[PDB]
Amino acid sequence: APAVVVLGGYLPSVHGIFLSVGITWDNDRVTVFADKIYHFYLKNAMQYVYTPTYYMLNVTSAGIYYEPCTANCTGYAANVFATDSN
């Protein structure tokens, strides 16, 4: 739907590769991105991702309009929060 949303993991600007599609690995789990995106369980452009990344985007029904995001962007999504002291 036409909405404003934040997403993350390992994704473009070691734990993943991207090309012009890509492959990402963590925690005995592999995710492959193609025309559709897939998951597998496996023990342990030519662009390489070393650290988790976040994106904030809003949807035109073509999702093509976005801003890259810093640390502390997770708190924009409606089902997550920064836990307070105690």
Partner 1 sequence: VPYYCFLKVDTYNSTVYKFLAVLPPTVREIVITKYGDVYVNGFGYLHLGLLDAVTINFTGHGTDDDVSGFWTIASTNFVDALIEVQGTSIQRILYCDDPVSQLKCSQVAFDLDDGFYPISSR
Ligand X SMILES: CC(=O)N[C@@H]1[C@@H](O)[C@H](O)[C@@H](CO)O[C@H]1O
Binding stretches for ligand X (CB under 6 A): 4, 41, 58
Residues forming beta bridges with residue 22, ordered by sequence position: 18, 33
* Nearest-approach distance from CB 41 to ligand X, in angstroms: 4
User: Quick one: what does residue 12 bind among ligand X, partner 1, none, with the CB cut-off 5 to 8 Å set by partner type?
Assistant: none
Closest residue to ligand X: CB criterion: 58
Which lies closer to ligand X via its Cβ, residue 32 or residue 48? 32
Q: Rounded distance, CA 27 to CA 82, Å? A: 24
Q: Which of 25, 30, 27 is nearest to 14 (CA)?
A: 25
Q: List strand residue ranges (DSSP E) for 19-75, in order.
A: 22-26, 29-33, 37-41, 47-49, 53-58, 65-69
Which residues are near partner 1 by CB under 8 A?
1, 5-8, 29, 31, 36-39, 41, 74, 77, 79-80, 86
